[PDB]
Amino acid sequence: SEELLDLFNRQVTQEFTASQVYLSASIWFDQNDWEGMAAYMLAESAEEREHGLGFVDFANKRNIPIELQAVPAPVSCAEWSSPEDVWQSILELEQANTRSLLNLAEAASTCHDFAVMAFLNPFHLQQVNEEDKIGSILAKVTDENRTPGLLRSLDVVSF
Amino acid sequence: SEELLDLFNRQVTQEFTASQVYLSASIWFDQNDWEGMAAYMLAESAEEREHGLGFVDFANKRNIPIELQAVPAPVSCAEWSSPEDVWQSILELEQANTRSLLNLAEAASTCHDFAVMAFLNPFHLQQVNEEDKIGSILAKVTDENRTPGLLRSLDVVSF
Amino acid sequence: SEELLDLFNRQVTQEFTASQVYLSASIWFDQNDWEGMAAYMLAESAEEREHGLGFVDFANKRNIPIELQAVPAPVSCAEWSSPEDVWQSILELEQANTRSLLNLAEAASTCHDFAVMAFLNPFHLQQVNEEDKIGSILAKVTDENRTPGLLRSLDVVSF
Amino acid sequence: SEELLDLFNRQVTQEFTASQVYLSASIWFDQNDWEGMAAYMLAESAEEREHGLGFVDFANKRNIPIELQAVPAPVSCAEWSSPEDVWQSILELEQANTRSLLNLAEAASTCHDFAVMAFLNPFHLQQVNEEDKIGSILAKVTDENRTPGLLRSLDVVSF
Amino acid sequence: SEELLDLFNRQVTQEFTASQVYLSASIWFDQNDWEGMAAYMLAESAEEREHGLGFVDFANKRNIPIELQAVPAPVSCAEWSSPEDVWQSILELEQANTRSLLNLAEAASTCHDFAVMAFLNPFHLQQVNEEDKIGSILAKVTDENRTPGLLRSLDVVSF
Ligand SMILES: [Fe+3]
Ligand SMILES: [Fe+3]
Ligand SMILES: [Fe+3]
Ligand SMILES: [Fe+3]
Ligand SMILES: [Fe+3]
Ligand SMILES: [Fe+3]
Ligand SMILES: [Fe+3]
Ligand SMILES: [Fe+3]
Ligand SMILES: [Fe+3]
Ligand SMILES: [Fe+3]
Ligand SMILES: [Fe+3]
Ligand SMILES: [Fe+3]
Ligand SMILES: [Fe+3]
Ligand SMILES: [Fe+3]
Ligand SMILES: [Fe+3]
Ligand SMILES: [Fe+3]
Ligand SMILES: [Fe+3]
Ligand SMILES: [Fe+3]
Ligand SMILES: [Fe+3]
Ligand SMILES: [Fe+3]
Ligand SMILES: [Fe+3]
Ligand SMILES: [Fe+3]
């Protein structure tokens, strides 16, 4: 029961952490002249914040007290050296978003908290979509970067 | 006094110079069947000329006497071999436009010429955007040009 | 600091004084059957008052105490004998508007008051446009008045 | 070859030269408060530059190497004293543009270069119309400047 | 002048011949799955035929007797192995179209046939545009085809 309140607060932190990691990915893309991939990461940064705001709102309604935690500095950017590394980190970030949502559902299920589980259902489906989409972009980015300059042409044309 | 009037006049010449350099870039791109990159240089050539006209207009209003210098012949075209060479020269050109605007601003600041400093503000911000845009284009052109033929795709598809 | 607060209040008084001088010019023109010139002077009166109101509003937001001074009777009217005299006083009123703005900016610069400096930039630019516009009307007025009756045609046709 | 290609280049220089002379006329007119005449010179300035770009564009298509030359400092502004002097230099400039075009056409005829002659036709007709329009303006300006101040109403009303 | 009436007739044959060669080119393109290049050759085939009709129409009005000649079997299809060989034959086709226009204009000039020469003028300018466009396409095709598969995206994306 305390576990439920803890996992809920951690979901908020995880959304906001994802939102900062996305922003760090747009900066890296922008600094390295991948403006289409940057615009994509920027849109994801705003979206992750909207998720965390959606959790905060539900918690206020349900009397789950939210104690906002520190949002840590993203640190992967120190090591990114190609768009491929950035997308790989983004895939790992969404895999962790999926794990924390399942931990939260598990706790809500243990507690028979039907309302929290109903709240979570659209996030579960949305995670399935997002992991698939990022997995597919990573596969494209990886295949295209096998020919010098070719990837640059995707950024420009798509995104 | 003298240094500020001089530099204001020189700014006009620098704008027309850059207009002619963009025209010469447009010619090399056309003669070499890069119509996309040519259309872009041609638009920049008109734009630099409009910058110079804006400086002449302000000088007329502020009674800064303008004397039109000769506009020098562009020199870099005899040595351009690939689009990379052209965008590099264009980057350098814009870096000189920037330094030029800084020197004029510095002379305005010493004279406490608040009107001239205010007039220059939007040009300083525009230079930031311009140097970024050209740096970004140069990085693409340099990356795509590592595969024979791939840069033609950039011109055709996206200019 | 004292200087900047005093100068900022003096700037308000200056704009209202200019508003009354323009009103005085409009009266003289009307009484002397120059209704085109009068209507121009009258739009100028309302505009100077709007400048003084913009300074008042900024001062309220920025906690600069405003103490509204008397607005002195315009005094040039008792000696105006031709439209040339009126336009000449108006040009001098605008040159005096410009210097007070520069002095205020100078005090703002010395105090590192970046907000006040930013607030002043569009007035510096507007004064440039105004002095040029009044200098140019005064040139036309002086030149057309060399033939008896001809200036009367300017008022009717183009104001 | 040789002669034709030379003259074709020189035509582009002539257009840009005229463009700078129009611009210097605009400055003179502005500084001396003839805004109506200055707007017209400024329009011609943009128009002469478009002619030169029409020539560059055709040369690119026809494989006529363009080497862009210095655009000479306009010098007639140092001696202009009144609008008649400016319009008189402008007449002379257009008479030189015309002779310049007739020379080029003469070389094309000699070379049997039918394409170049077809390209030149609308320019010959445009020059006939421009010399006529300028002569007419100069006639009006010379006539009106017989009475002090009267020319000042041409600028204000027309233009 | 038998020479003018013969060359005029030959020009009609030449346009219809070009029409067939273009059709032959679209066939090779289509058979080798270059559908966008194919559509462009087809469009040219129709417009060569229209040029031909335009000559026949003028001739009937000017009383130049037209005797329609055999339109020969296109033969370059036997040699073509890649898109480059096709575009190269198309360039030489247009160079020979230009050349026969120039012979025609020459015979017209000799006869002082002012109406014929006036009739040919837009075709001279059109030929300049065509040779340039084809030059440019062939440069792009040759460049892109330096990487296996790359030319296939030009057909898909740009035709
Ligand atoms: Fe998302
Ligand atoms: Fe999304
Ligand atoms: Fe999320
Ligand atoms: Fe997400
Ligand atoms: Fe997404
Ligand atoms: Fe620009
Ligand atoms: Fe510029
Ligand atoms: Fe620029
Ligand atoms: Fe730009
Ligand atoms: Fe005003
Ligand atoms: Fe105003
Ligand atoms: Fe004011
Ligand atoms: Fe004012
Ligand atoms: Fe005004
Ligand atoms: Fe015109
Ligand atoms: Fe011209
Ligand atoms: Fe002209
Ligand atoms: Fe004109
Ligand atoms: Fe065609
Ligand atoms: Fe044809
Ligand atoms: Fe054709
Ligand atoms: Fe075509």
Residue numbers in the entry:
A (entry chain B), B (entry chain C), C (entry chain A), D (entry chain H), E (entry chain E): 1 to 159
In the authors' words:
A novel ferritin was recently found in Pseudo-nitzschia multiseries (PmFTN), a marine pennate diatom that plays a major role in global primary production and carbon sequestration into the deep ocean. Ferritin is a 24-mer that forms a hollow sphere, takes up soluble ferrous iron, oxidizes it at di-iron ferroxidase centers, and stores the iron oxide mineral in its central cavity. Sites A and B comprise the conserved ferroxidase active site, and site C forms a pathway leading toward the central cavity where iron storage occurs. The structures confirm the typical ferritin arrangement: 24 subunits assemble to form a hollow spherical shell.
To determine whether occupation of ferroxidase sites and site C is time-dependent, apo-PmFTN crystals were soaked for 5 min, 45 min, 4 h, and overnight in 2 mm ferrous sulfate. Structures of crystals exposed to ferrous iron for 4 h or longer revealed iron bound in all three sites as well as up to two additional sites at the inner surface of the ferritin sphere. The latter two sites may serve as the nucleation site for formation of the mineral core. The iron in site A is coordinated by the conserved residues Glu-15, Glu-48, and His-51. Coordination of the iron bound in site B is by 2–3 glutamate residues, depending on the subunit. A bridging oxygen atom is modeled between sites A and B and between sites B and C. In addition to Glu-130, the site C iron is coordinated by Glu-47 and Glu-44. Glu-130 adopts multiple conformations depending on the soaking time and is observed coordinated to iron atoms in site B and/or site C. In the overnight-soaked structure, Glu-130 is tilted toward the iron in site B, whereas in the 4-h-soaked structure, it is predominately coordinated to site C. Only in crystals incubated in ferrous iron for 4 h and longer was iron bound to site C. In the subunits with water bound to site C, the side chain of Glu-130 adopts an alternative rotamer such that it is directed away from the site and toward the core. In the PmFTN structure soaked aerobically for more than 4 h, Glu-130 is a ligand to iron atoms in sites B and C. In contrast, in the earlier PmFTN structure soaked in iron for 10 min by Marchetti et al., the iron in site C is coordinated by only Glu-44.
